[PDB]
Design a protein around this ligand. Structure first.
Ligand SMILES: [Zn+2]
Ligand SMILES: [Zn+2]
Lengths: 46, 36, 65
């Protein structure tokens, strides 16, 4: 139910708050993305 | 071979793709046998 | 970079013809010039479409998450 961030390589829904490091549950790979918005988006279909 | 000596961690064997994203310098260590 | 649905010039559907064309080439070992005629792509506006597409998406897919 939900998520927030992600890990570039070991793509795995993560997340945390301030001063919780900036690493991942396993892959040190200190990157991390920010997975989509919930508010669905709409597009002109042309 | 390239390395990332960062505080709060070891020294990761740095790679292009990461140094680019992270704005680091894809460099490496230079060591010489100093004799005294 | 996935096949163009329809031809820029005359709009004739061409989205389906991708896979078919690739076969008439690898399997049925034909020549582009023919494989195209076979798929009903008559004038060059449609021909140029398929004959030229560079299906990059394949290399893209080869990445990971
Ligand atoms: Zn990870
Ligand atoms: Zn056409």
């Amino acid at each position: 139910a939900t998520l927030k961030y992600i890990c570039a390589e070991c793509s795995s829904k993560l997340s945390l708050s301030r001063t919780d490091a900036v690493r991942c549950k396993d892959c040190g790979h200190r990157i991390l993305l920010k997975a989509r918005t919930k508010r669905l988006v709409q597009f002109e279909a042309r | 071979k390239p390395m990332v000596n960062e505080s709060d961690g070891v020294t990761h064997a740095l790679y292009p793709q990461e140094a680019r994203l992270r704005n680091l310098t894809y460099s490496s260590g230079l060591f010489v046998d100093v004799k005294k | 970079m996935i096949v163009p649905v329809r031809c820029f010039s005359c709009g004739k559907v061409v989205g389906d013809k991708w896979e078919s064309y690739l076969n008439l080439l690898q399997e049925d070992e034909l020549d582009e010039g023919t494989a195209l005629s076979r798929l009903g792509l008559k004038r060059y506006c449609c021909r140029r479409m398929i004959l030229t597409h560079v299906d990059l998406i394949e290399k893209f897919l080869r990445y990971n998450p």
